[PDB]
Symmetry: D2
Subunit: 460 residues, 4 copies
Amino acid sequence: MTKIIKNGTIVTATDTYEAHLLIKDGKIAMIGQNLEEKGAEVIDAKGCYVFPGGIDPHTHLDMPLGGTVTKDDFESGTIAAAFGGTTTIIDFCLTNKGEPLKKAIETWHNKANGKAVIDYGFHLMISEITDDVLEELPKVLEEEGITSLKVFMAYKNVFQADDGTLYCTLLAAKELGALVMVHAENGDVIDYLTKKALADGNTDPIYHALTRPPELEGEATGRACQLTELAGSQLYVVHVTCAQAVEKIAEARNKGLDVWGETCPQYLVLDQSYLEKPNFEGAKYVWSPPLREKWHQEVLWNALKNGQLQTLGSDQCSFDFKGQKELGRGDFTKIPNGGPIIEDRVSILFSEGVKKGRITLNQFVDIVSTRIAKLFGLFPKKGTIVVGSDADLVIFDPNIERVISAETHHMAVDYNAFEGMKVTGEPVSVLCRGEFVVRDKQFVGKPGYGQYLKRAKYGT
Amino acid sequence: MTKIIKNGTIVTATDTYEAHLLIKDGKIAMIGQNLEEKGAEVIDAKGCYVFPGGIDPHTHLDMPLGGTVTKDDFESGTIAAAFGGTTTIIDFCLTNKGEPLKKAIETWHNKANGKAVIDYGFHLMISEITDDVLEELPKVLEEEGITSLKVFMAYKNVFQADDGTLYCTLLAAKELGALVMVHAENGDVIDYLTKKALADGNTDPIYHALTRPPELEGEATGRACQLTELAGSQLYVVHVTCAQAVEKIAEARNKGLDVWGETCPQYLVLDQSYLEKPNFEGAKYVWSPPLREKWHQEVLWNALKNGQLQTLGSDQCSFDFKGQKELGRGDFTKIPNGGPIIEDRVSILFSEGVKKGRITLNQFVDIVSTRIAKLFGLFPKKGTIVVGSDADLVIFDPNIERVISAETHHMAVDYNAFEGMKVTGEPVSVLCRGEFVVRDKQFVGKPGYGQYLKRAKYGT
Amino acid sequence: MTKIIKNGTIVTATDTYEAHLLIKDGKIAMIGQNLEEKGAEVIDAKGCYVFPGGIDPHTHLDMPLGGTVTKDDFESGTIAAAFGGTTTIIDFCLTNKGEPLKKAIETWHNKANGKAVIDYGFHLMISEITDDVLEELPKVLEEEGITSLKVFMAYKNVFQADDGTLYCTLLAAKELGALVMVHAENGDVIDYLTKKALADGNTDPIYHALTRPPELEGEATGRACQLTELAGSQLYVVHVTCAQAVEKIAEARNKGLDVWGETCPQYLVLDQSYLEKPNFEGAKYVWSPPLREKWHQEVLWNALKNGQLQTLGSDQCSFDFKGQKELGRGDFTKIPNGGPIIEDRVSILFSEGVKKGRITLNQFVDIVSTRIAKLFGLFPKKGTIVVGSDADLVIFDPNIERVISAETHHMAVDYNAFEGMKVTGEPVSVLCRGEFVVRDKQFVGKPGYGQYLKRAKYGT
Amino acid sequence: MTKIIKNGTIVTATDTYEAHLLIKDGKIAMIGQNLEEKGAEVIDAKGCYVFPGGIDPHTHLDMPLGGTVTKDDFESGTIAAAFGGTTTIIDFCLTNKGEPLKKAIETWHNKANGKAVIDYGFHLMISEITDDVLEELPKVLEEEGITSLKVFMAYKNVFQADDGTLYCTLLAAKELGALVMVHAENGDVIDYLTKKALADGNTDPIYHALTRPPELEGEATGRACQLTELAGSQLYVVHVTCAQAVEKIAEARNKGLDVWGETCPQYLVLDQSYLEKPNFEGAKYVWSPPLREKWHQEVLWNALKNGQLQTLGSDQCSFDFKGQKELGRGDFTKIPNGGPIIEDRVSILFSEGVKKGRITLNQFVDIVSTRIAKLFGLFPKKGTIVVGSDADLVIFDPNIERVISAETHHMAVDYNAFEGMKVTGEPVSVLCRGEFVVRDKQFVGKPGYGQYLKRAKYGT
Ligand SMILES: [Zn+2]
Ligand SMILES: [Zn+2]
Ligand SMILES: [Zn+2]
Ligand SMILES: [Zn+2]
Ligand SMILES: [Zn+2]
Ligand SMILES: [Zn+2]
Ligand SMILES: [Zn+2]
Ligand SMILES: [Zn+2]
């Protein structure tokens, strides 16, 4: 059923113009001004921007971190993201050793199946390279568009992998045509620090941060790079936090190495102090890598501005401060890591970035949608507003001033890391593939509408 | 008179899709598929790409380098560029000390007046900062869209300016909203080297290169940067040649400094040896900075690939090998510097870059058009294929294999620096503002059709 | 019994003068010219240099690497070094997990006890940091002058330690006042490479080198540094081989970090090719890190010249090519790592370094004796020729040209890695604490004369 | 007349031991303990260190900076340095264009002739490279031991030289065997800044500093280096002040380039604030490069600690705050640059450096004496305490606590830049070539005793 979004200001990763969009088969049929066609529902976007739906490449929805599981599942999370201006997510499908990869992949397909309000895809976790694994990978690429393999350098005895596993993954990746993602923190050192902290009675939420200094993020990020170099493949460092890390990634890209960096709003806006703010409130901000000192934020922004860092992810991993977060009272190491971010990701960048001088209206769209779609083989189906691309759009209001509050967010968590934060700009209507998911700040989608996405081989 | 370019594959700096373009007021009216409108001339672009016309920010047309002047004037040069897929050029309007800036600006306007086949703009040369100059600059910005002021760090006693001049220019620029361009070569050292070379009988074309080692390009590029930092303004290093230079620019951009780098095909494809190839043929390749050792080419390409360098210019400055180039027989320093490049710029990057694995079809468009339009305030009038933008298009054939030959080029020079070079891809139809300038590899424009362009203040 | 070494040219790490040395209580009593004292044995050193005995901080004598043990034990090895101009060695006392440190320390004291011809000390290996270990360390410092604790980043499942162990060692070290030494190679990656090499039939000696690329040495050296920085202690990288490694150490020292680098002759003179030279001869050159490509040698020398690297060790670990080396025929990983170097260390540096333009006669003395004595708390007892210091001297002939041959060396190995090598300069008389150990190229010492050395706390 | 300094603790750049020195022909005859010889004056040094007299390579004594001349001439200055523990100075012999070099050299010889209390040498200033200059240089080396040529990159229209002059000097130097010294500050930029400062009424002493930002010192230092590289010669950057400069010099030495850095106490202890401290007092601290922000001091010390910087000079250039300094009341640019430092140089480094943890008792001697003697061809005549070397000694008391005060200093200036500064350690007896110049903190020398020094060709 044809639609026409008129009088809006279109803003792609490159262009900024005024025109109307004629949506047809759930795709953009044509762009121009004063469009008309009997029967079109004609949506009015006056005084609004029309962005390509956002893409969150860093999602953890039905993921289990402890005896508990994320408060937000694939259903709530999808809706949240939908309100936040995000219309496509790529969640991390976790893997267990010895167990066949297609096992996990189906487990995840079930988690998402019929509950997604918007489209999604997966990243495959890798904790070991077995002959059995090597045999599946190629299949995992063709059947199941999983073209991005992930690796934890931290989280000893839980996700961590030795450099040998990382290295062979990089090769396999280069060979098969996949992008290696990496959680760059020196697990082995963080481990001793963690143990000693506890051994000395330091259990408060803040020791979560002090127990893992930025030096260890930088160090890890470096190895990932050096190895990626040796292997001659491609790297994508997730959630770049400290300056040290930004630096390593900068050097890499200078050498022509195919390395990419990503960050998350929480690291751009919040900081280490929030972990001290008080009683047990700290736990609300416990996630890895830990929030750093306020000063790193600049470095991140500049990196974003000049290109050292090129994508923004949420690292969405919700846990009620109530039941969940409290699991680690007299033990910080027992606080489930993760924050409720999938919803305010886009907004915050526009507000803190665009609206304040950092980033450009175009850089914005690139950092939150396009660049990502490209790196993860979703372009041009996703990531842009052009004839042929899916009608994943966001009718955004750039002037509405508001305050982020858990009293308003649509995530199933009992709190919001950006509570009380004033923000300029807000999504008004968000549609995925020609169909509204959120019209006039009101939900109108249906769980199951979202469909899985097989992704390009890191090629066209 | 309405037109429709159908069945082409549209390729912007971001998008790559299939659709038709409905050209209206010399601008792009609308994009979509199966477009129709009685009376439209309907152009067929099957099996072709449709790029935003190229923009050459580095042009020297009616410029005089010696007792002689460039073989190509604004008329021939414009046509050449037109055939080469370039529809907008920004020539360097030279300045004389003590003489009022508006004097030169009009001299240039005359050189271009009624001879341009495509649109153009100017860069204002600066050899000194006088109170009189400071008074004109602001006017030079508002009246006359000249928002890019240029400086030579080399060419002692001819264009060169001390760091004080460079520094105050950077300030003035930051203040007024202009981009400072720089020819980064250590003129004072190159000078002694030059003199000594001659004093020892080394007069062949090759000593033009040996007389100015890449160390001096890097050194100069560094000062420009360090000073740009101190001043807190914006830099744009023209024709980056050696690795050393690329490096300095890389460091700058890492520090968040607002520095930009540009290169030219000749430095990407040719190399120092050509200056030895033989008799006097060397002089055909004499230009500054000099061609370096083959190995720097990689560095350049990687810089282009990863973003250290972001724009491609021609540095067009033609001289017949016959009369002109020969002016410096027993004296290389008397060979007029400059090469016939304005025509094959775009093609070479597509062929050597895109077609061979370096750059992307999108990076290509960015490096040759978009990125440039943006940095020099011509976006979105120029630099892209979108509703509202000027209909500056290029219907390109990506498969036609051919050989660059002066026997075929459309420049008024008796030779071509890329003679015999095999190239893949070629412009078939090039239109500026809805009107064909070159249809089916045949010229159909009219000198004077091209119009001057007032450019943005380094802002929207 | 008083002695007088006259007519020699004294060369310390700083001075170069002509005088006589009056040796008294096994120490240098006084320096001056035309010395006399009834009853003094008066040794004549005309046309000779008098260097402070060399100090080899990298020794593995009675060490066991496999079902076998080093061909040279503390007795032969001591004599060898004695002939080589080395009068003090610091061997690496290996440690086993769970087993008390003082156990090993005594095991070693036994290996050396009554067999040493010259003085010696120990380095304590660390494979784990236990509460039990933390309790002994302080004692290990006071009782037993062991002030240098060593860590293997490679040799997985044999010596290797995680970064946590390395990090806590660095702290303990900073706290206790010890120097952390490190074998910087990424064991986990070398491991997979090793396994795969075999899995593909690559078993020749050369795969020992290819199985462990310099990238992995640099990578490892980097971590060691970064961690040393975090901990704020002191590092000493043993056997720096590749450029990558030299670079990391250079960066560290630039940052003011207290990092030190050491190299060995074999890496300064031999290279990767020797591992291909032929049949099974390759095995003669198998040791870790592996010999690199000829070009790294320069980097090493420059590092040595300018100070990036400051000490020369042998990494003495002999194995008869016959029985021992052959243990790894169809399996390179089974070739015992180590080379017969303790004897030609000093000579080679003088010849290849001093005599050829690299290093200085003074730098020489510093790199082979003084600098080492200082870093390992043996100064000024050892490492110099000055009133009060032990009479550890070497009467060297700087002109004697000769050829290193196993047919002449005094090591118990059936071969010599520098066989056929022409060398200028040779030790004529070597005395430890006033007593000759080697007079006129003839052995005159007695096993047991050498005494253990308790070393300074990395202090005065 | 034979002398014996007994019971002292000898401290060279390498050694630290207890012995007696038998001084003979004004040189050190022999070292040992319990020395005796009828008729020797036997000096007692119990509880004292005995250092090799200090060497100040950065002196400006009878130099004229304006219509005025340094308050301290070669006589007073010599005595001052003598009290300060310095026994050898190398003053900068200034040069005028067009005027023959030997003219200036004799002018200087006159300034020093019969007024020096200790030994001295000269540096030859170079403001231009003429054929006439090229002819003298070689003579200037053989006749007149002037083997160090100096160049100002700042002080436009007064001492400044273009890069061409600097470059050819570097070559000449490499060729002839001289060391090029450089005052690294970007004169052309400092110039505009200076002019503008005045044009805006900023005339206070502090604008002397703000008028020349550290970016300009680093920039300049970089060129000197890059050029020194191109030329392949040797550089020696005088008075390294900011971090930026230290960095450039660090990079240089990393590349193996033969570059050296020097600093001065005032930059190690004082800082920018002193220029604001108040009324006109600021002028007391006006010298170039200007004092920087307190934080650079660390960088300097670390550079000194790790070796990025290797020598300490005074940059002595006294001017009575009264008449002289006041010449620039309403104009800072008219304040004669230079500070009264030749006397407390050594002491301050011992106190602030040695006594406080930075530097070593040995590093101390190296940084203030030895390293310098070596770089400027005075070793081993000067710079060490060894048989054969001149008896230039300093009997130092390491515990005497005191306060530096113009009320006590022996310089002819009406003030002291370190007034009120508490310092530990003080010279008790200073003798040059076996003769006391200062015995028991009391002057006993005679102007004229000091003799000129022809220096080595940057060789043995
Ligand atoms: Zn993570
Ligand atoms: Zn995550
Ligand atoms: Zn140019
Ligand atoms: Zn040009
Ligand atoms: Zn080892
Ligand atoms: Zn070893
Ligand atoms: Zn100076
Ligand atoms: Zn000076």
